[PDB]
Design a binder for this molecule. Structure first.
Ligand SMILES: NC(=O)C1=CN([C@@H]2O[C@H](COP(=O)(O)OP(=O)(O)OC[C@H]3O[C@@H](n4cnc5c(N)ncnc54)[C@H](OP(=O)(O)O)[C@@H]3O)[C@@H](O)[C@H]2O)C=CC1
Ligand SMILES: NC(=O)C1=CN([C@@H]2O[C@H](COP(=O)(O)OP(=O)(O)OC[C@H]3O[C@@H](n4cnc5c(N)ncnc54)[C@H](OP(=O)(O)O)[C@@H]3O)[C@@H](O)[C@H]2O)C=CC1
Ligand SMILES: Nc1nc(N)c(-c2cccc(Cl)c2)c(COc2cccc(OCCCC(=O)O)c2)n1
Ligand SMILES: Nc1nc(N)c(-c2cccc(Cl)c2)c(COc2cccc(OCCCC(=O)O)c2)n1
Ligand SMILES: O=c1ccn([C@H]2C[C@H](O)[C@@H](COP(=O)(O)O)O2)c(=O)[nH]1
Ligand SMILES: O=c1ccn([C@H]2C[C@H](O)[C@@H](COP(=O)(O)O)O2)c(=O)[nH]1
Lengths: 522, 526
């Protein structure tokens, strides 16, 4: 086939377009608006474009030309192909595209030279056949893209997913998932007030003596069916940060220890993982299934007021703590003298009143115990290089009085160069149902603390102690592992809030959340 | 072109330590024992046999034509098996059932015996040069010199070895023949394996050496201190850095190269990073760092004092353990606003939180029996009676008591994990002095894991070290540059007196560190 011989690739940047809402690859399809780009200026895409359409490997060319000659008969640059409309839109100082053989497909133009013009697609394969070039990149225009994809002349699409909405005239054609497959996903980035990532579609099939040393050092190296993780195992580059979560799921399914549970539910378990999410580049809200945050934010606000009254949450239809406050749950816990939905000295109490005698959920605890939360905020503002900036919910004295002992043992904070990072240590991690919400909670918490200390959020670092997958989440997680993440959304806080106690539900906005379908984990 | 590169001649050996401990010096020549009375110095080390088999039988057919090409070129010409070469004494030592070595072309060096003296499928050669002639006329992948001391010695001196695959057997036996002293300018270590236990010894495997476009695109955005670099020449020369000690050393390198400059308490300045995990397999080795000398008497006395629930610094000072001396002084306590604290009364620190969390601290002499929560007793009962519990945590960070402590704990919490009769331990460290504290902290929580495992009738599995604020002191940088260019030794082992059934019944004499091999003392302070 002619795209393998001549190495014809497409490179495009697609934004989202105006009108639950359902998402798919076609979500990202905006190319142009009235002759020009639909977006202001996205310098990381500009930079990826330059490096991709510029890169040549002279050491690799011998093989390309042999192939090209054998198929025909016998300083290195790439070729770049544009439609006339596309060519028009390009400024001036960049106009004869640097270090690239500029080919222009037009039925109207002809002429300068060293800069080629072609009347038909077929007349590109002729020109390719007569040039020394490394690879051929189609820079498009909708029409150019439309016709090259129709003719099956594309080996890979280098597709930038610009995760924001613009007014658009012209759209990338709908890539058929039967003709092309995604093999690679980049890291997620923030450039010019949008997140974005870089994915690669490929056309489907329808002094190395230290290599033996590797084998020698490997001389001593679960009824899951990997063949069911086909999309997951096929991917070459899984750099999207959502793979930190998905890879842990894969590791527990493949290598996890079979253990029984309180009920006899059964888990696969492992011990000790770290995930790190860059809050400067994205908000890490899982995209491989639908996640809701109103509950999560109300829980955090409830913690921050130091509440222990489950009814405050139930009256707002936040039901996270409902099972933990029933008569039966508290009686099983030997809390015979505890009122229904009185969760005892849990998170909120330990954050605002650590060490105070707990009475009931209605008592006035003002100025009682250690206000750890106010203390960690003062340490951050007045002693940011302190290695003592910890918020601890694990009150050993109070554990038996809590509806249950906290899963989220502590937060530690780190300040460098006006930036705030947070470690949270979780003793017990329900990878299928809990951990996704848990990453979102403490990611939101890191933004709130950062903003009230006039700092920028940097990393949220999640340490997993007992890390388990429920045997009844395994089918749902097989489905989830075979979905390709989308670029992450962004979190906006109302910028007016400079005190940790002044946030309300309306101060929080998730932007550009693109996600696959809700999964019922059981 | 060199004969050893055309014909791909390698040596493979296993060397133990030899007969003669207080102020003892170690170097690569520590591991030199090859044999005793015409057999091996040790009974069975089955993992070394497994490794020897895998190296001497492995072939990549799809790389042979390339090697054929090269050999023909050099000689002026146009199932695949390795060759193995043995001295006659070596051959006679091998049990009958193992001869000739299966799936290998067997070659024996002899003058006294000829081919009529052998029943087996073997080539007899009476000089080194006839080996080279033979290799020139055989189809084979690689050639392994399996020794004899006389065979190794004559193949090294003649520069006919491209690499030595060297097993370091970290135990002492009676030897009468020895591997030649390797010349550090002829041969250099390029690679070091994981550390293993086999047949009640630790061992590792080192290698001496004779002295895609899509990937590029996804790295389009690749950008710190680099304010000492390639002072790490040996560190950076190594290809495979698999010894678990590199978990420690690689974090040091990461902090030096990418660390953030910040002030701290003392005002001495550090390089800092946030969030690391190390994991040590206590079933396979005791991770006592070997790139500098460490002593354990003090850290074991500290641990026993923690378990006793003690806060009296004078108890350690009377055993000549000074770990807590500086945090016990009038000036230290007064600068903490502990004006009403007696000298060396460290307040409600680790041992108090482990035995009496929640009790009102009075003084270091009070009897706190049955006050506060005995967390230590609770986790031992949880491990025995509820082993799948996700609540097996021992926590020293008592928020209420922080200001009463000489200083707040660095070692915040231990979480335990039980599967299949093995105990693992995560310890979370809020603040980690990589150059001085962390080496001791690894050894301390590794021993604790052993103690808890034994008293709950479990075997130790992993000690998992989580580092929060991980820092290198600027005054330690030159000392750590030295340490990082040192090649780790196979780790020692830890034995406990097995008669101890209760966490509280341990004493210093119940602990033995065997086969500690290390580089010399470093003063971290210049
Ligand atoms: N987001 C992205 O990655 C990219 C976006 N764009 C945007 O898209 C728009 C440009 O694309 P769109 O309007 O389709 O225009 P195109 O660039 O696809 O241009 C179409 C023109 O190219 C010529 N042409 C097309 N097919 C042939 C053929 N088969 N043989 C000979 N000539 C042919 C004709 O020129 P003639 O008129 O001379 O006959 C045709 O009118 C702009 O808004 C631009 O900024 C462009 C590139 C990439
Ligand atoms: N730990 C380890 O990795 C290893 C240990 N060993 C141990 O080493 C000991 C035996 O080794 P060591 O005593 O040196 O003896 P060797 O195995 O080195 O064999 C020595 C004999 O081989 C013959 N030989 C050597 N070189 C030549 C030559 N260039 N030309 C002709 N013949 C040659 C001679 O045999 P002849 O006298 O018949 O001419 C010589 O006496 C044993 O204890 C064995 O268990 C051996 C290998 C590896
Ligand atoms: N990933 C990706 N794919 C695409 N195909 C396009 C794209 C979009 C429109 C026109 C062109 Cl030529 C390329 C873009 C966006 O980047 C642009 C767009 C328009 C002009 C432009 O300036 C000249 C390039 C200078 C240089 O590379 O040195 C850069 N992104
Ligand atoms: N790393 C390393 N290098 C060495 N050269 C030797 C060695 C030692 C003595 C004789 C020989 Cl042939 C090889 C050893 C230990 O060798 C042993 C010991 C016990 C059994 C053994 O298996 C031989 C048959 C198994 C097989 O290969 O099929 C090999 N270790
Ligand atoms: O914030 C939370 C609270 C709970 N869990 C999950 C982990 C376990 O499945 C269970 C806690 O049960 P124990 O570990 O207390 O037995 O709830 C979380 O993942 N996150
Ligand atoms: O067991 C210990 C005790 C102390 N430190 C080091 C870390 C810090 O450099 C210092 C205490 O730091 P702060 O209290 O200032 O965080 O002691 C350790 O690494 N481990």
């Amino acid at each position: 086939q002619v795209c393998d011989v001549f190495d014809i690739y497409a490179i495009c940047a697609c934004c989202k377009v105006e009108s639950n809402e359902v998402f798919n690859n076609y979500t990202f399809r905006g190319l142009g608006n009235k002759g020009v780009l639909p977006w202001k200026c996205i310098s990381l895409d500009m930079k990826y474009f330059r490096a991709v359409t510029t890169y040549v490997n002279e050491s690799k060319y011998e093989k390309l030309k042999y192939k090209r000659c054998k198929y025909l008969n016998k300083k290195l640059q790439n070729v770049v192909v544009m439609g006339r409309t596309n060519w028009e839109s390009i400024p001036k100082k960049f106009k004869p595209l640097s270090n690239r053989i500029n080919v222009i497909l037009s039925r109207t133009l002809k002429k300068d030279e060293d800069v080629y013009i072609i009347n038909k697609v077929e007349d590109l394969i002729v020109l390719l056949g007569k040039l020394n070039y490394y690879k051929c990149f189609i820079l498009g225009g909708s029409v150019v893209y439309q016709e090259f994809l129709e003719k099956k002349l594309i080996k890979k699409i280098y597709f930038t997913r610009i995760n924001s909405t613009y007014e658009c005239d012209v759209f990338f054609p709908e890539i058929n998932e039967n003709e092309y497959q995604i093999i690679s996903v980049s890291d997620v980035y923030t450039s010019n007030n949008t997140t974005l990532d870089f994915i690669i579609y490929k056309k489907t099939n329808n002094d190395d003596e230290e290599e033996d040393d590797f084998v020698y050092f490997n001389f001593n190296k679960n009824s899951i069916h990997p063949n069911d993780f086909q999309i997951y195992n096929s991917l070459k580059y899984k750099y999207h940060p959502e793979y930190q979560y998905l890879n842990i799921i894969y590791d527990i399914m493949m290598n996890g220890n079979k253990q029984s549970d309180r009920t006899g539910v059964g888990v696969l378990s492992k011990f000790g993982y770290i995930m790190k999410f860059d809050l400067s580049q994205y908000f890490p809200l899982l995209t491989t299934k639908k996640l809701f945050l109103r509950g999560i934010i109300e829980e955090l606000l409830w913690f921050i007021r130091g509440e222990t009254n489950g009814n405050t949450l139930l009256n707002k239809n936040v039901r996270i703590w409902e099972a933990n406050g029933t008569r039966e749950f508290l009686d099983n816990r030997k809390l015979f003298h505890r009122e229904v939905n009185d969760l005892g000295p849990i998170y909120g109490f330990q954050w605002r009143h650590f060490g105070a005698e707990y009475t009931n959920m209605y008592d006035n605890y003002e100025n009682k115990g250690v206000d750890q939360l106010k203390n960690i905020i003062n340490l951050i503002k007045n002693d940011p290089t302190s290695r003592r900036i910890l918020l601890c919910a694990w009150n050993v004295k109070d554990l038996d009085q809590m509806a249950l002992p906290p899963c989220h043992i502590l937060c530690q904070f780190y300040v460098f160069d006006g930036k705030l990072s947070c470690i949270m240590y979780q003793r017990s991690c329900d990878l299928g149902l809990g951990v996704p919400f848990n990453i979102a909670s403490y990611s939101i918490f890191t933004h709130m603390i950062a903003q009230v200390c006039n700092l920028q959020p940097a990393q949220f670092i999640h340490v997993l102690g007992n890390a388990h997958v429920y045997n009844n989440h395994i089918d749902s997680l097989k489905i989830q592992l075979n979905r390709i993440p989308y670029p992450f959304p962004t979190l906006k806080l109302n910028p007016d809030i400079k005190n940790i106690e002044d946030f309300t539900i309306s101060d929080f906005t998730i932007q550009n959340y693109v996600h696959h379908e809700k999964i019922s984990m059981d």
